[PDB]
């Protein structure tokens, strides 16, 4: 996260770290949506142009963390993956359209003060909150600058941007399964996701029921925190039929 700040303890208890087993490193963010299911970006797991194609036994999930690099004894929980599901129509060749994946854990994780699932939006939620100017929150352990790494989880609040401005900021073809967020150059405030934040959640707190909803997944960007560029996010509600199909077919 560029130009964010340190999270508070327990501020994002649905935050998940995807951790490569060997060599031990941050791969991506993710989010906890139930005791056995983790949501991330497909490009965290599959992106052939950069020779990325991870299998279940290549990774671990670390839940309840705050510190990036430390083993947070008696707080974090580490889970193995039973199976990865990538959207069958994930468009890695062009624009990461439908940039979404699910991971089923081998065993259910116990919830705690530090470990708790986020809500997924329904149609009405999305309609009420996915509006230009409305702000969401992005969290992660990724880089602090485009060109270093944080000691603890970083957090930044960013406004959803008007779709014509999103489209006019890039040469990449945007789809209805994406939205963009960030400040404009004339707005003076700054902030973005960056390398290692991919897959993490874009959340909004409903003013109707006081609950946090995951509206987005950190998807692609061109640089990080560049004037006149915006980060792009997978539109979770638009892909929820797929989420529900997978969990109804394969959940326990």
């Amino acid at each position: 996260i560029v130009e964010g700040s340190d999270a508070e303890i327990g501020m994002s208890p649905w935050q998940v770290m995807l951790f490569r087993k060997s060599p031990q490193e941050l791969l991506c963010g993710a989010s906890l949506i139930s005791d056995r299911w983790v949501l991330t970006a497909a490009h965290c797991l599959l992106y052939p142009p950069w020779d990325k194609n991870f299998t279940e036994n290549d990774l671990l999930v670390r839940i309840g963390k705050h510190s990036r690099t430390r083993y947070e004894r008696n707080i974090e929980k580490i889970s193995m993956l039973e199976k990865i599901y990538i959207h069958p129509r994930y468009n890695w060749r062009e624009n990461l359209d439908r940039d979404i994946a699910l991971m089923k854990l081998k065993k259910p994780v116990a919830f705690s003060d530090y470990i708790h699932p986020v809500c997924l939006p329904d149609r009405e939620t999305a309609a009420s909150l996915l509006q230009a100017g409305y702000k969401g929150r992005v969290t992660g352990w990724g880089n602090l600058k485009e060109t270093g790494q944080p000691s603890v989880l970083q957090v930044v609040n960013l406004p959803i941007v008007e779709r014509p401005v999103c489209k006019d900021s890039t040469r990449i073809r945007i789809t209805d399964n994406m939205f963009c967020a960030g400040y404009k150059p004339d707005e003076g405030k700054r902030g973005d996701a960056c390398e290692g934040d991919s897959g993490g959640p874009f959340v909004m707190k409903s003013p109707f029921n006081n609950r946090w909803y995951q509206m987005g997944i950190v998807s692609w960007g061109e640089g990080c925190d560049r004037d006149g560029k915006y980060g792009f996010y997978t539109h979770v509600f638009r892909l929820k039929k797929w989420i529900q199909k997978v969990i109804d077919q394969f959940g326990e």
Binding site: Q24, E25, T69, R70, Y71, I78, M80
Partner: peptide, 10 residues
């Protein structure tokens, strides 16, 4: 840079 995690999870 990352602290070793318990053997049990590897």
């Amino acid at each position: 840079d990352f602290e070793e995690i318990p053997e049990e999870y590897l």
